[PDB]
Design a protein around this ligand. Structure first.
Ligand SMILES: OC[C@H]1O[C@H](O[C@@H]2[C@H](O)[C@@H](O)O[C@H](CO)[C@H]2O)[C@@H](O)[C@@H](O)[C@@H]1O
Ligand SMILES: [Ca+2]
Ligand SMILES: [Ca+2]
Ligand SMILES: [Mn+2]
Ligand SMILES: [Mn+2]
Lengths: 240, 240
């Protein structure tokens, strides 16, 4: 299809079009990307991701078209600790993507340790909401919580200072305009606090024509729940 | 997802989200549901169907919601014969639906001979464009080409006279309004000729909560090409 759109206002347990990887599962009408115990508390050493089953036609060499896309979603992070880890990310990757071995903790379930910073060995675009930045283990991170745009590397090409708020839902709008090639990210808390980050990227040189979209999250030694509450997505191939 | 939509203005050979069954295949940016030889001419004894891979949430018990959906599509039929057969149909069925054994010819690849007219043995809603009505073989048909609404039986719950036009595209809009429970069908040729037929049906009594949508066509001893040229579909769950 030249166009595709879907909307999940909530996430009932009766799911048919979601690919669950790692510890991800539906609980209380929301997707819990990382593992939790019986009491519902987050646990250490867990990775989880979800992908929508239908493949998205991001670009078509045949007609020289590139798709625009808009992903809107909300999530909340909760933890008994003051420094919850590691973060959640919206990502786009080849259809057969799977959790790389050893991609836990700060690698957010998106990159393999040995090639996490090698841009020629990866095929992924992600928008991360990173809450852990200790320089001993996350040497690639700025020294503060942040939102970042990742293009084939865990070391973001662009970041913006962000504030983690335990239990509060963050509303996010990610849009890609093929005409300007700008990937824009706008995130806001209910009180109006807004964060914005943008980057120019030619998706044709990073990803294959058909891709899958989804979310990934992980917790290493530090932990927090990564609860995806809602998600809507739309893409349309355009000639610019 | 509560809502899903996709659009195929045309059908390029590079498909990822279509399930091809039988002889269905893409040729010249269109779906040829029934087999054609090297020259593109129709042949006898062929059946083919396509389904969109993502499952559609038609209704939800827990929330008492039912989907409002619309399916717009265009097709053309061509045959050197004076009595091209057998017809094409848009259908909705359980996700694991496959071509029934012996469902060729007048059964349009949708029903098995033994239970084709047993409403308790089937789970399918289809809108058929039936071009073959020989009273000796297709005993269930009115004596003329017709558009029919099929609910669990090859014997349409209702039909309207229709004119088959060789090589001309027919544009069809099929919609279902959960508030009135009306399934409406409007079909038009490029010269303004219009056909309309409606039927009140509670889809919850006929189909499971999750279903797949697609097209089916077949040719028995008589034949014609059944070319699906374009297709767009949208569905959203509504209170009810
Ligand atoms: O989950 C946070 C973090 O945990 C693990 O690294 C640890 C932290 O840097 C901190 O707790 O100090 C530990 C001792 O130096 C260190 O192991 C990793 O899983 C890391 O990837 C993750 O970001
Ligand atoms: Ca980090
Ligand atoms: Ca017939
Ligand atoms: Mn980071
Ligand atoms: Mn009929």
């Amino acid at each position: 299809q030249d166009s595709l759109s879907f909307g999940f206002p909530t996430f009932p347990s009766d799911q048919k079009n979601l690919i669950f990887q790692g510890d991800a599962q539906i609980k209380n009408n929301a997707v819990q990307l990382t593992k939790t115990d019986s009491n519902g508390n987050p646990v250490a050493s867990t990775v989880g991701r979800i992908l929508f089953s239908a493949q998205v036609h991001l670009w078509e060499k045949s007609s020289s078209r590139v798709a625009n896309f808009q992903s809107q979603f909300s999530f909340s992070l909760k933890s008994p600790l003051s420094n919850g880890a590691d973060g959640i990310a919206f990502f786009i990757a080849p259809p057969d993507t799977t959790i790389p071995s050893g991609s836990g903790g700060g690698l957010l379930g998106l990159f393999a340790p040995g090639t996490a910073q090698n841009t020629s060995a990866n095929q992924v675009i992600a928008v991360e909401f990173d809450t852990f930045y200790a320089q001993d283990s996350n040497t690639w991170d700025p020294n503060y919580p942040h939102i970042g745009i990742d293009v084939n590397s865990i070391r973001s090409v662009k970041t913006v200072k962000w504030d983690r708020r335990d239990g509060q839902s963050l509303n996010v709008l990610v849009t890609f305009n093929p005409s300007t090639r700008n990937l824009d990210v706008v995130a806001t808390y209910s009180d109006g606090t807004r964060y914005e980050v943008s980057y120019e990227v030619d998706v044709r040189s990073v990803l294959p024509e058909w891709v899958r979209v989804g979310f990934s999250a992980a917790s290493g030694e530090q932990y927090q729940t990564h609860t995806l509450e809602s998600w809507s997505f739309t893409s349309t191939l355009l000639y610019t």
